[PDB]
Amino acid sequence: SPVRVGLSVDASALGHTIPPDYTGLSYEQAQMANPNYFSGANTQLAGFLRTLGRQGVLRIGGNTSEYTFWNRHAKPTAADEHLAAGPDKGHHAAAREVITPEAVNNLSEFLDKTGWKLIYGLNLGKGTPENAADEAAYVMETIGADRLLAFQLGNEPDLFYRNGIRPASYDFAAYAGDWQRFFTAIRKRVPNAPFAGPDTAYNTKWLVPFADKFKHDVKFISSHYYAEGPPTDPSMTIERLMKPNPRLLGETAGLKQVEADTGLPFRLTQTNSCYQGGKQGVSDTFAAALWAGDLMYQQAAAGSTGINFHGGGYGWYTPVAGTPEDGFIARPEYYGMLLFAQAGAGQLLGAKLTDNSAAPLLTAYALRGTDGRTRIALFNKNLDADVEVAISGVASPSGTVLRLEAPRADDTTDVTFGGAPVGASGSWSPLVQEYVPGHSGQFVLHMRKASGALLEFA
Ligand SMILES: [N-]=[N+]=NCCCCCCCCN1[C@@H]2[C@H](C(=O)O)[C@@H](O)[C@H](O)[C@@H](O)[C@@H]21
Numbered sequence: 284s285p286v287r288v289g290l291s292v293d294a295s296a297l298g299h300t301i302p303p304d305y306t307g308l309s310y311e312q313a314q315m316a317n318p319n320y321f322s323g324a325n326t327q328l329a330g331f332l333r334t335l336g337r338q339g340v341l342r343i344g345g346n347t348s349e350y351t352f353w354n355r356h357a358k359p360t361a362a363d364e365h366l367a368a369g370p371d372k373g374h375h376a377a378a379r380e381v382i383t384p385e386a387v388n389n390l391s392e393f394l395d396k397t398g399w400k401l402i403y404g405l406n407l408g409k410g411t412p413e414n415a416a417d418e419a420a421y422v423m424e425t426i427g428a429d430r431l432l433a434f435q436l437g438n439e440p441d442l443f444y445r446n447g448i449r450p451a452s453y454d455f456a457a458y459a460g461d462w463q464r465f466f467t468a469i470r471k472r473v474p475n476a477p478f479a480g481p482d483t484a485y486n487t488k489w490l491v492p493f494a495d496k497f498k499h500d501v502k503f504i505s506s507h508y509y510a511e512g513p514p515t516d517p518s519m520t521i522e523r524l525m526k527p528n529p530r531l532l533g534e535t536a537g538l539k540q541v542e543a544d545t546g547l548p549f550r551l552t553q554t555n556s557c558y559q560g561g562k563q564g565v566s567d568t569f570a571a572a573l574w575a576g577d578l579m580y581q582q583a584a585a586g587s588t589g590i591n592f593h594g595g596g597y598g599w600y601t602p603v604a605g606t607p608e609d610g611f612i613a614r615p616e617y618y619g620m621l622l623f624a625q626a627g628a629g630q631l632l633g634a635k636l637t638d639n640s641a642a643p644l645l646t647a648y649a650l651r652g653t654d655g656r657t658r659i660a661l662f663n664k665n666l667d668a669d670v671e672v673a674i675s676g677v678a679s680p681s682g683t684v685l686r687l688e689a690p691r692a693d694d695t696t697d698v699t700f701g702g703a704p705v706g707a708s709g710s711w712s713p714l715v716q717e718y719v720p721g722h723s724g725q726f727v728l729h730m731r732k733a734s735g736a737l738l739e740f741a
């Protein structure tokens with residue numbers, strides 16, 4: 284029988300306001316070697332992005348950003364015209380790639396088709412300041428100030444000391460000197476170039492020193508998050524993925540403190556469940572939908588300006604999989620992002636759970652929509668417990684529910700939202716209508732184990 288929990292919504296308990304460009308995706312820079320991928324001709328992928336949000340941010344970076352070499356006279360290889368660059372697996376050095384004017388031109392058209400903004404990595408790991416300045420100038424020329432949100436100078440510079448990009452002694456002080464050299468060169472070509480950083484993988488010690496040094500030179504602070512811990516941890520499981528992550532909480536507190544010290548907001552510019560491209564049986568499953576949707580809300584509630592789920596190719600954790608030649612599909616994680624998209628923007632409200640110790644991985648978020656209607660996003664991440672949620676603090680004549688479902692937490696397919704899969708080119712509309720039982724001030728929602736729900740009140 285279900286665990287009977289209470290949820291009290293408090294319309295006076297005002298949280299953060301979710302911005303319209305919160306959602307986003309991250310891709311490997313190597314993908315820019317193929318001018319057909321981020322292209323106005325890529326209508327399938329553009330549709331998948333639009334379904335994730337009418338505003339949002341595309342970030343391009345990752346390990347391959349140290350292996351991409353812009354040149355104004357470059358041409359893609361024949362193989363480049365067909366490249367599908369999935370998440371770098373981190374086992375050895377990435378292949379060298381060139382980036383061309385054509386690809387940047389086509390990226391511009393892709394951003395126009397999607398309505399999304401751009402965070403663009405520059406090659407601080409192996410490239411030169413002058414080449415970065417030239418690349419930045421072309422990007423600014425072509426993409427424009429309104430769509431270019433920030434350049435980033437290197438990806439995960441806190442890992443250069445161990446991945447061959449720099450010697451073992453590389454540290455924040457060394458990075459700060461590299462950053463300044465690149466910044467100076469770029470600003471000579473592009474005096475209005477916007478920056479974010481430090482784009483770190485994990486090392487929270489770099490946040491303070493970076494922000495204090497470069498606070499007048501950046502628009503926002505960026506860092507990364509993977510749910511999987513260090514290599515010496517036990518292998519990630521779905522059970523672990525559903526549970527709170529104290530490292531996340533600490534990282535988020537570090538970022539909040541930077542904002543308190545400097546005024547700079549923060550964005551989680553690369554995230555996913557498990558590293559090395561993901562873990563088959565965890566990252567590519569329905570549990571990842573629950574994980575991702577919940578993470579989006581947790582971070583929004585903490586004051587993040589947005590998020591960018593890493594992906595590409597057919598990587599285990601990619602939200603969207605596919606290629607221009609074979610087409611694109613929504614993977615399970617996409618459906619958690621879709622729940623967020625459908626909820627929309629607005630101000631988060633207090634949403635306190637009680638009587639929930641037997642269903643501790645249920646999370647709930649309440650929102651006053653931009654349209655004035657109350658929504659509640661719930662993630663029943665308990666893998667073995669169904670819940671019955673008694674909802675107080677909401678007065679409405681009618682509420683509806685859209686369910687986020689799969690038959691098993693580990694399913695790699697069979698994921699639906701609102702009773703429907705996402706179709707080709709991101710097409711989605713709900714096919715199952717359900718009213719929330721109960722009435723004004725006392726609604727009652729059942730949720731099966733390992734499921735999610737979006738409630739909308741009239
Ligand atoms: N503690 N400690 N240090 C050990 C390092 C572990 C932390 C992150 C390592 C994996 C990061 N690695 C993430 C990703 C992946 O491995 O899936 C890959 O595709 C992207 O290109 C990278 O930017 C980033």
Ligand SMILES: [Cl-]
Nearest residue numbers: 539584585586
């Ligand atoms: Cl806060």
